[PDB]
Amino acid sequence: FKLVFLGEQSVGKTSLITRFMYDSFDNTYQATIGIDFLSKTMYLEDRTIRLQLWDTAGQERFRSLIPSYIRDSAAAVVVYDITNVNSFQQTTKWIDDVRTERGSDVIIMLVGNKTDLADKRQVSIEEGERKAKELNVMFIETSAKAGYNVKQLFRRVAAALPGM
Template identity: 65%
Template structure:
């Protein structure tokens, strides 16, 4: 991803780059934890399920160019899956997460990738 960002930033000097990154995966695999660690270097030991969709932003610099990242946290519960396609449509990056201690969450990666590609 860094090469693509650097290339686009170089071809658009002075323009602020913005990328929407959607995190997908089963419930309680760590999507929120990954986003919180990246955006604020924090970790909450208490589990709290994401309701629907949430997002945080982080500004990073790539080759001295400002890049704004929107990190979208999706709920892994089945009842919220119908919301996800509308958030994936205009995203540039999809990150599928799974829990290494849950074989089922790993096996569900294929369905998350398929949903992202629709």
């Protein structure tokens, strides 16, 4: 099951993955160079879901590679930063990009990350929910830093993956 993480640079794609994989968080920003692969098999009672995590770069110089990264994805996790309006606005085109590559053969989750920065919120949870409904995708808010909703993010995505 190919799961691609997408979104603007510095929204916390890698940190979400690190938190899910290792229950750790690093405050120091280490930009993803193109793509990094990780594997995690989620061991549910009725199925086994070998996740192939495609951690993609949000930096502009890798943008041309994004279509190739989305190719054949079973799931797309589109991440924004709740403190960054631009990052939220850009999620429509990320989700658009997934749709024109995958049509309906993809599970899409819209993630509003960094809820630990509640003081600096620029996008409300209602705005996030609204966009998800408009774009017919799932929605969740997370904090990679605190750990909040990270396990839930991955569990909900995996639950949504079609059986066949």
